[PDB]
Amino acid sequence: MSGPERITLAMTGASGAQYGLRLLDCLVQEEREVHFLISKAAQLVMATETDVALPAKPQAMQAFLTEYCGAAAGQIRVFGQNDWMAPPASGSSAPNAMVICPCSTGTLSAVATGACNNLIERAADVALKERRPLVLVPREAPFSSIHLENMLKLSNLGAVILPAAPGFYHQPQSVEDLVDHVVARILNTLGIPQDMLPRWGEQHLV
Amino acid sequence: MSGPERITLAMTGASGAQYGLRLLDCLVQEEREVHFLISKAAQLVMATETDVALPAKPQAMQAFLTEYCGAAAGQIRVFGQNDWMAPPASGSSAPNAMVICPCSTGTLSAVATGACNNLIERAADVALKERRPLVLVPREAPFSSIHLENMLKLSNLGAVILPAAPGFYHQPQSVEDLVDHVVARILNTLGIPQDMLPRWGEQHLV
Amino acid sequence: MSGPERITLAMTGASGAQYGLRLLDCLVQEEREVHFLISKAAQLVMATETDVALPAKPQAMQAFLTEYCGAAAGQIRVFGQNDWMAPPASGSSAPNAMVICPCSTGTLSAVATGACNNLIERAADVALKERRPLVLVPREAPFSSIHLENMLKLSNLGAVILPAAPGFYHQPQSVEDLVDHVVARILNTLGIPQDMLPRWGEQHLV
Amino acid sequence: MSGPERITLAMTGASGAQYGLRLLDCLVQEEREVHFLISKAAQLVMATETDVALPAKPQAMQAFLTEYCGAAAGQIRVFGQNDWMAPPASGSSAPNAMVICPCSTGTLSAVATGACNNLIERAADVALKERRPLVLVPREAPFSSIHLENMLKLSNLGAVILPAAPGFYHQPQSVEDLVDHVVARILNTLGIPQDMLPRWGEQHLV
Amino acid sequence: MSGPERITLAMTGASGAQYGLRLLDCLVQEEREVHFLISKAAQLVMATETDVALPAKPQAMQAFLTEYCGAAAGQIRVFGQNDWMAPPASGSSAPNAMVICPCSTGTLSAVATGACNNLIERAADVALKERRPLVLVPREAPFSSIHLENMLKLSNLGAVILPAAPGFYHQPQSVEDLVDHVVARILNTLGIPQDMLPRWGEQHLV
Amino acid sequence: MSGPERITLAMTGASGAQYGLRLLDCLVQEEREVHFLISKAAQLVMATETDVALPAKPQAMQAFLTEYCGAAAGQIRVFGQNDWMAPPASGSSAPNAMVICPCSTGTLSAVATGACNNLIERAADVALKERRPLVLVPREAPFSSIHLENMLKLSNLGAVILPAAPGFYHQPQSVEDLVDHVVARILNTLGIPQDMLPRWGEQHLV
Amino acid sequence: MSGPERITLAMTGASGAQYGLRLLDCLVQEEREVHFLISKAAQLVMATETDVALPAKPQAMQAFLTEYCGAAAGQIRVFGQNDWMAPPASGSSAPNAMVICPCSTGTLSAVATGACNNLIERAADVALKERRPLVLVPREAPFSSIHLENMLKLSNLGAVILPAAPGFYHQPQSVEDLVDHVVARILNTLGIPQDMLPRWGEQHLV
Amino acid sequence: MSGPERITLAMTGASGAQYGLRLLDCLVQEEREVHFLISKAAQLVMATETDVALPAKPQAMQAFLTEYCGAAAGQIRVFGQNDWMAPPASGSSAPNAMVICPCSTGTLSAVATGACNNLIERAADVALKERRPLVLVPREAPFSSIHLENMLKLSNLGAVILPAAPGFYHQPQSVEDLVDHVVARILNTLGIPQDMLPRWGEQHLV
Ligand SMILES: Cc1cc2c3c(c1C)C(C)(C)CC=[N+]3c1c([nH]c(=O)[nH]c1=O)N2C[C@H](O)[C@H](O)[C@H](O)COP(=O)(O)O
Ligand SMILES: Cc1cc2c3c(c1C)C(C)(C)CC=[N+]3c1c([nH]c(=O)[nH]c1=O)N2C[C@H](O)[C@H](O)[C@H](O)COP(=O)(O)O
Ligand SMILES: Cc1cc2c3c(c1C)C(C)(C)CC=[N+]3c1c([nH]c(=O)[nH]c1=O)N2C[C@H](O)[C@H](O)[C@H](O)COP(=O)(O)O
Ligand SMILES: Cc1cc2c3c(c1C)C(C)(C)CC=[N+]3c1c([nH]c(=O)[nH]c1=O)N2C[C@H](O)[C@H](O)[C@H](O)COP(=O)(O)O
Ligand SMILES: Cc1cc2c3c(c1C)C(C)(C)CC=[N+]3c1c([nH]c(=O)[nH]c1=O)N2C[C@H](O)[C@H](O)[C@H](O)COP(=O)(O)O
Ligand SMILES: Cc1cc2c3c(c1C)C(C)(C)CC=[N+]3c1c([nH]c(=O)[nH]c1=O)N2C[C@H](O)[C@H](O)[C@H](O)COP(=O)(O)O
Ligand SMILES: Cc1cc2c3c(c1C)C(C)(C)CC=[N+]3c1c([nH]c(=O)[nH]c1=O)N2C[C@H](O)[C@H](O)[C@H](O)COP(=O)(O)O
Ligand SMILES: Cc1cc2c3c(c1C)C(C)(C)CC=[N+]3c1c([nH]c(=O)[nH]c1=O)N2C[C@H](O)[C@H](O)[C@H](O)COP(=O)(O)O
Ligand code: NA
Ligand code: NA
Ligand code: NA
Ligand code: NA
Ligand code: NA
Ligand code: NA
Ligand code: NA
Ligand code: NA
């Protein structure tokens, strides 16, 4: 197996709920264990932007997502926003890679300053102190200087700032094609196999 | 008329040629005069990503774009990359707003450092020294710290860093819907009317 | 009409509730549409420092403030602290100027770091990314270096840091006279007519 | 006796002459020795904003202020703006605490840069090099980034930046009540007894 | 009317008195109200470099300049260097744009540090805190790092640093032609009509 | 296999063409796939400093280098300076490590600022945004502060700054021995086996 | 002989071609050897702003300039923009002082960042690393913060930033008089005799 | 005589003992007085890398080096590492230029921080405070960010950072040829004649 066996996937309240759901689906299909976290504002984004009827409490959310993705039992773990006994909350936990997708500007801010106000923010704080992979997927426009300084600080610290900015260079034909471009970039960054985005120039000899 | 009468629209070599073309179309439909600039690498992006057969030389490019957009005579001006006699090259020119869409990381770098190697880069240098509007639309992922520092410097100077990061919160049904979200943000930033992106919460009283 | 048609007026938990109320009154009398936001701590300041019996829920607060100011129907909109569907929460909203008066040091901090924890903080984050006017009215003493660095960062970004520091140079005779000095400065900054603070030296020829 | 026996009280040309006069009165009533300094612009502020007829030359100013405050003989010393033989001008002097109230933005600038152009500015330069207390009471609005950077530099060096921003949380009934709030904060900062501002929550057990 | 109705025009002691006089003439011919300020060192520059016999006291200076420019009564106001009751000294004044032309390196320094030692320096301090236009026209060579850091700080704050560096690209035939180039740039920056500098490339279609 | 299977080897115009050629030879002998890039100025360095008759066009250059190194078919790929369809130009490409050897101060500058003016510079920009290995081998003396700041920025970002500064501590007997020291350091940095530089102190027990 | 025997004189594409030509003339008349470099954009400036018919290729340009200045044979050397075998390209060359006059903002940028894209930029990079004199003569207005930061960086490194800002204090009577002021400043900076600008106050005893 | 009459030559513990010895030889042949200093670690480098049997104590080391170089009596002075009475230890000494060749990263660090732990480090501290020439010849690879920041600080202060990075552009045929390139660069930097490195392009006319 290439790439991390366990991924902490946090969804926070920026537009782009489809990116998180599609990423979750691909992680499940690659037989990865996913520790799934979702903020209160992200739950509202999902209700506004999609037809997914995501249950509110973690136990029922875990059942729903398992059915939605066709995951194995225990493959998707769901942890609530104040569950400090969950693996992502401590560096003594087993190593995960972490993705925040979408990453709201508020969560971006909290991770940059170390606010640790909820399990998503603490889990990123832990990823940085343990030097485990951390990928942030912001979705905002314009990016203000406040946004950019927070992204730059975290990038300087080794976090990967991967904006939800799909490329158009494989003739996209649908919204789903654009979503897949970003999801493929994330999987590439994590080192996890994907077949949605070809290897640029791989056939190009001279 | 709300917003600028004249817009310098530069296209540079990031993916997202559709954003530039659609923005050009909307500017024409709003009866704006457009000074159109396109880099050599952007011409290659357009040939790779779209079915637009854009002529190479400025005179023929100007004819093509006028037909493509249904523009009036002289409404679209095309200037070549070393035409230092064109309006965008001097601050003594008449005031324009400027948009670089897409904005490659190379053009982002040149504007941040003041390289002024071609008319697109000099025109942005002029926009900054004259404190005229400058909007950059980067399309890249991940954003490295090199990218982010250049974006932050320019944002601190008053340029608008508007990444090609479409929002999903008006139920997009096609690639064109996502393109329009970004194009609408640009038009909003310039203060030019648009009807593709509703005013959020405008009906919301309490 | 001079100045902004719509103003987001946020009250947060620093002493000086009278400044916010008087500013709200003047905005109403200038026929401006006001999107009114108030933090939980500010509600407690108002109960401690004034005899205003402000209702707690937005619907009833909106009724009360309309009566208090003699506003027209719909002229004052009240939005709760987690109402992400309200206009101030998105840059795709119609343009407002924004004033935080009083601005607590906690809200000052959140805006400086981009925390976006509630609608007041997100609305300021949106004002900065859209380059729409943002005026902060802190009331604190001493200002620590933590306070000052946050004020300096935001001032460098174009926010107006307007401390609740009334001037004495028009022979004030009451608390209300000192309140009006600050409120007049805010209206001047927004470009909205006021007749409480004369134009200094306007009659002075030589 | 709690707090400093000797206080250098400098008045400079910001609005708020009443704060300086009331502070001088309270220092006298607490039996402190006051080295009183006043700038040329502050003399003009006092003539504009109050009915105090302050004599111009130090000898007569010293007589007037002694009568005004009911001070003992020699309790108030007045020194002119170029009197480099006065105690405040040398660090070899006996230790004083220093307050500049009001502190103009020009005096703020001079102290931040070390300009030492007059006795007020040199005395503050001496307070900083000897690490003796220095309290600045600016009165300005907006604070520009120039103001804020100067305040931040001095706060980082241990000066207390105490803006003339009265609090409203003890039901003020007059201009004098608001003046007293700021004067009480200054006395608190110096460690000198005052009974104008109660100790917040002192009776609050749980 | 395009551009500001009122302009504060300060002349300080760099070489280039002709620029200030010609700018004053053009502002008068565009029917603008001018608040004219001149430093002691600038008066000496004018006596050294020109044949203008400028009276020393403001009242007589105001009479002379009115005759010199052919201005209407009250169109040119002259204020002395310590006239703190003049409009430029307070932000509560009516809005002006401000130009310092020529701008000595000493006045550049004072504005960068906030020294506010005279009415010219305070008026610029007020322009910055009120975010009203401020244009500085330095004339010096070489620019030292001290000069450049002061110019950069002020440019970062939104002041326009416009050096007296005339362009040669409209075939200048006299000293007056070079003066007019700089004066035209200033008028362009203020948004005030001028016909001395053509709009570059305005006729250039492709 | 230890170390990267694919290496992008860029040669740019600093003295030390022998280092690049010898590194290319060792990579081939370790059965690595090499994507070979060479700048116009580097071609001139090679003609000036060596007797290698390197063909100019990529197709013929690829034939020559394959013969020169005894490489397998397709093992060395050559890409021209504007071939944006080559793998190194996009982060969606398959992962490579990248070495610029020699690295001119001009290419050092471009990578530090993100200029992306040609395929070598873009490929390094891509290596940094994808956090793939990037090794720069500058050859210059003195290093100016411009050089050093660019090297420091890139080192802080995780690029390896490996100057062409051979060590003398294995009794070098020829120019080739000194070349091999640097080439061995590069291979060590990449994690690729080499037998030219012994493991220091490997036999040293106490 | 006072001052440098050899001067590298680079002309780049800012307005002010007359300054470069007049400086070249004075260097020739002082019997200095001049290594003359001119950018493509500067050639266009010279054709636009003057009646000098400068040949394009270096050999013919060298003949023309020798006749134009009345120079001795070999006294003016002309080198093309990619002639890396010319003395200015290597620090191992014989010591020259270097002047870029006019210095475009693009060349200013390249020297500040170390871009070294052509012989002019590399020659300045070499002057800085060898700590040989480097004088830049920018001609631009306004100077943006991008311009100013580049000038400040280079000034901090010991380059002389000498803007084309002529002084008026020797009663100039023509364009040529203003040109000579700047040219005289450059010669003063290089330590080369000139008689166009008197020594200020040289006769002034007390 | 061109260049300094007296040179402090310090050898510290980086590889490249041959550079120091060859530089010492050339300084002697140019009839310069050399104050020779060598660290304990450098003595070990010399024993490891060369066949020079350098005596340990200064008196015998001075005899050996005089014979080795064929120096005149008293032409080479040797001072021990704690000889604070030696000329290099005080700025009141007669002016020397100073070279540290090789310069270990430890000595680089000490000079950058001012550690002054031995005579070599103090002598460099003295060279910097007296603004006398200081040339550092580091030999290390990779350069870490710790190395680079120390080199940048010292370069900004006017020290010459000259890495042991020989050039290959005069067809080197032996180790000695590469050593001579670096030694020639050092002599060039000091302004001392050398005939090992030709003047680049000196014969190149056009
Ligand atoms: C509920 C909500 C919140 C949006 C929002 C919307 C919704 C429905 C949309 C989808 C209609 C439009 C855009 N949204 C974005 C957004 N923040 C952001 O950084 N990017 C966004 O694209 N916000 C605000 C963000 O959710 C708030 O600032 C939260 O405080 C974030 O909290 P969290 O980090 O804990 O999720
Ligand atoms: C030709 C080409 C260049 C791409 C590229 C592609 C093509 C076809 C695609 C479309 C297949 C994939 C992505 N592209 C991007 C890109 N640079 C960038 O910042 N974002 C991009 O999305 N690059 C590189 C960029 O064009 C180069 O760095 C140019 O030097 C930019 O030059 P310019 O600023 O003058 O346009
Ligand atoms: C309830 C409360 C909070 C005061 C306070 C008081 C009250 C009654 C007063 C009125 C008696 C005295 C002073 N107050 C101030 C204050 N914060 C501040 O920056 N300036 C103040 O003047 N605070 C604290 C501030 O409200 C808290 O730090 C909140 O967390 C701010 O939260 P908010 O930004 O969401 O309003
Ligand atoms: C005379 C004068 C000067 C005012 C002023 C007024 C007057 C009458 C008022 C009272 C009508 C309105 C406001 N004033 C302020 C002010 N500077 C400042 O920082 N805050 C102020 O509130 N200024 C300007 C300030 O006095 C000048 O910049 C002086 O140079 C300060 O010099 P100083 O530090 O030596 O006192
Ligand atoms: C009187 C005087 C002062 C010159 C000067 C001359 C004169 C006659 C000239 C005209 C002969 C030559 C050049 N001048 C300049 C100059 N300062 C400057 O920045 N640029 C200049 O070009 N100075 C110095 C400047 O005037 C002093 O530093 C003043 O202190 C500035 O004070 P101010 O800002 O209040 O005007
Ligand atoms: C042609 C050429 C260019 C040399 C040069 C020489 C040649 C023959 C030598 C070999 C004779 C001597 C030294 N060279 C160096 C050099 N730049 C550098 O950083 N280190 C060097 O050692 N330069 C300059 C460098 O090539 C230019 O600045 C190019 O613009 C670099 O462009 P590139 O990065 O695209 O290759
Ligand atoms: C051809 C051209 C280019 C001008 C220009 C004009 C012309 C005719 C004028 C003379 C009509 C007006 C002003 N010019 C200036 C200018 N750049 C600058 O920094 N200052 C200037 O004054 N520019 C732009 C500058 O030449 C470009 O940015 C080039 O890329 C510079 O390239 P270079 O550094 O290699 O010369
Ligand atoms: C004895 C010794 C020390 C080497 C070393 C070796 C030896 C034999 C070699 C020659 C086998 C290989 C490389 N050497 C280097 C080195 N430090 C350095 O900056 N560059 C080097 O090339 N070091 C370490 C350096 O000498 C130590 O860090 C000392 O503390 C430096 O002390 P000094 O500055 O007082 O001389
Ligand atoms: Na917390
Ligand atoms: Na250029
Ligand atoms: Na939050
Ligand atoms: Na002084
Ligand atoms: Na002052
Ligand atoms: Na480019
Ligand atoms: Na280059
Ligand atoms: Na020590």
Identify the CATH number of the domain in which residue C55 sits.
3.40.50.1950
What size, in residues, is chain G? 206
Q: What is the DSSP string of A141-204?
A: SSBPHHHHHHHHHHHHTT-EE--S----TT---SHHHHHHHHHHHHHHHHT---SSS--TTTT-
Q: Beta strand pairing status for A160-161 and B76-78?
A: unpaired
User: Tokens standing for G23?
Assistant: 């400086």
Task: Give Rg (Cα) of chain G.
Answer: 16
Q: Are the CB atoms for F139 and H165 separated by under 8 Å? A: yes
Q: Beta strand pairing status for E134-138 and E160-161?
A: parallel
The residues, ordered by sequence, that sit 6+ positions from D144 with a Cβ below 8 Å of its Cβ are C155, E114, E125, E128, E129, E157
B118 neighbourhood in chain G, CB within 8 Å? none
Whether the CB of F48 sits within 6 Å of ligand 6 = yes
Q: Residue G87: which of H188, H189, H202 has the nearest Cβ?
A: H202
Element (H, E) at B99: strand B97-103
For the CA of G167, the nearest atom of ligand 5: 22
Q: How far is F81 from chain B (nearest CA, A)?
A: 12
Nearest CA in chain A to B49: A169
Q: Any known ligand binding at E201?
A: no
Q: Give Cα separations from C129 to A141, A163, B155, B185 (angstroms).
A: 8, 16, 10, 12
Closest CA to G131 of F120, H158, F154: H158
One-letter amino acid at E151 equals M
Q: Are the CB atoms for G126 and G93 separated by under 8 Å? A: yes
Q: Any known ligand binding at A116?
A: yes
Kindly report the protein residue whose alpha carbon is nearest to atom 17 of ligand 7.
G14
Residue entry with tokens 């490409």: F93
For the beta carbon of residue B3, count every other beta carbon within 10 angstroms: 17
For the CA of H17, the nearest atom of ligand 8: 10
For the CA of G106, the nearest atom of ligand 7: 34
Counting other chains too, the contacts that A178-184 makes at CB distance below 8 Å and 24 or more residues apart are A178/B166, A178/B175, A178/B178, A179/A18, A179/A19, A179/A22, A180/A22, A182/A19, A182/A137, A182/B141, A183/A19, A183/A22, A183/A23, A183/A26, A184/F92
Buried b (16+ CB within 10 A) or exposed e, E101-115: bbbbbbbbbbbbbbb
Cα distance between residue H182 and residue E129, in whole Å: 56
Cα distance between residue H137 and residue H159, in whole Å: 11
Task: Tell me the three state secondary structure of residue H99.
Answer: strand
Cα distance between residue F34 and residue B151, in whole Å: 33
Q: Residue C200: which of E74, E93, E131 has the nearest Cβ?
A: E93
For the beta carbon of residue A49, count every other beta carbon within 10 angstroms: 18
Closest CA to G187 of G18, G24, G10, G13: G24
Cα distance between residue F61 and residue F174, in whole Å: 28
Q: Are the CB atoms for F185 and F99 separated by under 8 Å? A: no
Phi, psi of E42 (to 5 degrees): -65, -35
Whether the CB of B104 sits within 6 Å of ligand 2 = yes
Please state the separation of Cα H97 from the chain's center in Å: 10
Cα distance between residue B83 and residue B123, in whole Å: 11
Q: Angle F17-29/F175-190 helices, nearest 10 degrees?
A: 60
E198 touches chain B (CB under 8 A): yes
What size, in residues, is chain F? 206
E156 neighbourhood in chain G, CB within 8 Å? 145
Q: Are the CB atoms for B14 and B138 separated by under 8 Å? A: yes
Cα distance between residue D145 and residue C158, in whole Å: 9
E62 neighbourhood in chain C, CB within 8 Å? 205-206
Residue entry with tokens 């002349």: E11
Closest CA to H91 of H65, H118, H125, H64: H125
Cα distance between residue H196 and residue E179, in whole Å: 55
Residue E164 DSSP symbol: S
Buried b (16+ CB within 10 A) or exposed e, H96-105: bbbbbbbbbb
- Spacing, Cα G117 to ligand 10 middle (Å): 7
B74 neighbourhood in chain E, CB within 8 Å? 205
Residue entry with tokens 């030589």: C206
Resolution (A): 1.8
Kindly report the protein residue whose alpha carbon is nearest to atom 21 of ligand 6.
F14
Q: Are the CB atoms for E200 and E9 separated by under 8 Å? A: no
Residue entry with tokens 């840059």: C91
Task: Give Rg (Cα) of chain C.
Answer: 16
Q: Beta strand pairing status for H6-11 and H33-38?
A: parallel
Residue F144's DSSP bridge partners are: none
In terms of Cβ atoms closer than 10 Å to its own Cβ (0-12, 13-18, 19+), residue F195 is: exposed
In terms of Cβ atoms closer than 10 Å to its own Cβ (0-12, 13-18, 19+), residue B187 is: buried
Closest CA to G81 of G57, G98, G62, G103: G57
Scan residues 46-65 of C and list those with Cβ closer than 8 Å to B: 58-59, 62
Number of separate domains in chain F: 1
For the CA of F105, the nearest atom of ligand 6: 19
Kindly report the protein residue whose alpha carbon is nearest to atom 3 of ligand 8.
H13
Q: Beta strand pairing status for G6-11 and F160-161?
A: unpaired
Q: What is the DSSP string of C144-169?
A: PHHHHHHHHHHHHTT-EE--S----T
Q: Any known ligand binding at A113?
A: no
Whether the CB of F141 sits within 6 Å of ligand 6 = no
Does the CA dihedral G137-G140-G143-G149 come out positive or negative?
A: negative
Cα distance between residue E16 and residue E11, in whole Å: 10
Report CB contact under 8 Å: E148, G151. Answer: yes
In terms of Cβ atoms closer than 10 Å to its own Cβ (0-12, 13-18, 19+), residue F204 is: exposed
User: Tokens standing for E92?
Assistant: 């509560």
Please state the separation of Cα A87 from the chain's center in Å: 17
Cα distance between residue E193 and residue E187, in whole Å: 7
Cα distance between residue A15 and residue B170, in whole Å: 10
Domain that holds residue H141: 1-206
What size, in residues, is chain D? 206
Cα distance between residue A128 and residue H98, in whole Å: 45
Q: Are the CB atoms for D118 and D39 separated by under 8 Å? A: yes
User: Tokens standing for H138?
Assistant: 């580091």
The residues, ordered by sequence, that sit 6+ positions from F165 with a Cβ below 8 Å of its Cβ are F182, H138, H139, H140, H141, H163, H164, H165
One-letter amino acid at G148 equals L
Cα distance between residue A16 and residue A18, in whole Å: 5
For the CA of B49, the nearest atom of ligand 2: 10
Q: What is the DSSP string of F144-191?
A: PHHHHHHHHHHHHTT-EE--S----TT---SHHHHHHHHHHHHHHHHT
Q: Are the CB atoms for F12 and F42 separated by under 8 Å? A: yes
Residue entry with tokens 């300060």: E10
Whether the CB of F82 sits within 6 Å of ligand 2 = no
Cα distance between residue G43 and residue G58, in whole Å: 12
Cα distance between residue F180 and residue F195, in whole Å: 10
For the beta carbon of residue D101, count every other beta carbon within 10 angstroms: 27
User: Tokens standing for H179?
Assistant: 């050593």
Report CB contact under 8 Å: F114, B143. Answer: no
User: Tokens standing for H152?
Assistant: 């940048």
Q: How far is F148 from chain G (nearest CA, A)?
A: 10
Q: Residue C206: which of E59, E88, E89 has the nearest Cβ?
A: E59
Cα distance between residue C7 and residue C35, in whole Å: 6
Cα distance between residue H99 and residue A203, in whole Å: 54
Q: How far is F175 from chain G (nearest CA, A)?
A: 21
For the CA of B12, the nearest atom of ligand 2: 36
CB half-sphere exposure, H1, CA atoms < 13 A = 11
User: Tokens standing for C39?
Assistant: 């933090």
CB half-sphere exposure, D99, CA atoms < 13 A = 30
Q: Any known ligand binding at F68?
A: no
Residue H35 DSSP symbol: E
Please state the separation of Cα A177 from the chain's center in Å: 18
- Spacing, Cα E61 to ligand 6 middle (Å): 63
Best H168, H176, H177, H178 member to test F by mutation, with max F CBs in 10 Å, is H168
Cα distance between residue B185 and residue B192, in whole Å: 10
Q: Angle F58-69/F17-29 helices, nearest 10 degrees?
A: 70
Q: Are the CB atoms for A92 and A132 separated by under 8 Å? A: no
Cα distance between residue E86 and residue E119, in whole Å: 8
The residues, ordered by sequence, that sit 6+ positions from D161 with a Cβ below 8 Å of its Cβ are C142, C143, C148, D136, D138, D151, D154, D155
Does the CA dihedral E143-E147-E148-E152 come out positive or negative?
A: negative
G8 touches chain E (CB under 8 A): no
Q: Residue H139: which of F151, F160, F167 has the nearest Cβ?
A: F167
Please state the separation of Cα E14 from the chain's center in Å: 12
Report CB contact under 8 Å: B94, E199. Answer: yes
Where helices occur in E37-102 by DSSP H, the ranges are 40-49, 58-69
Size of interface D-E (CB pairs under 8 A): 49
Cα distance between residue H141 and residue H147, in whole Å: 10
Spell out which residues line ligand 5, taking CB within 6 angstroms: E 12-15, 39, 41-42, 44-45, 48-49, 104-107, 139-140; G 167, 169
Residue E8's DSSP bridge partners are: E35, E98
Please state the separation of Cα A17 from the chain's center in Å: 10
User: Tokens standing for A129?
Assistant: 């102190």
Spell out which residues line ligand 1, taking CB within 6 angstroms: A 12-15, 39, 41-42, 44-45, 48-49, 104-107, 139-140; B 167, 169; C 84, 90, 116-117, 122
F83 touches chain H (CB under 8 A): no
The residues, ordered by sequence, that sit 6+ positions from D106 with a Cβ below 8 Å of its Cβ are D12, D13, D41, E114, E115, E116, E117, E122, E125
- Spacing, Cα A14 to ligand 2 middle (Å): 27
Q: Do chains B and D touch (3 or more CB pairs under 8 A)?
A: no
Residue B136 DSSP symbol: E
Cα distance between residue B153 and residue B148, in whole Å: 9
Task: Tell me the three state secondary structure of residue B138.
Answer: strand
Closest CA to C69 of C119, C109, C30, C100: C30
How determined?
Answer: X-ray
Q: Are the CB atoms for D120 and D100 separated by under 8 Å? A: yes
Phi, psi of G77 (to 5 degrees): -105, 135
Task: Tell me the three state secondary structure of residue A34.
Answer: strand
- Spacing, Cα H7 to ligand 6 middle (Å): 31
What size, in residues, is chain E? 206
- Indicate the top mutation candidate among C9, C12, C15 to test ligand 3's pocket, ranked by most ligand atoms within 8 A of CB: C15
Rounded to the nearest 5 degrees, what angle is found at the Cα of H109, between the Cα atoms of H106 and H113?
A: 145
- Spacing, Cα A143 to ligand 2 middle (Å): 21
Q: Residue D15: which of C17, C140, C169 has the nearest Cβ?
A: C169
E132 touches chain C (CB under 8 A): no
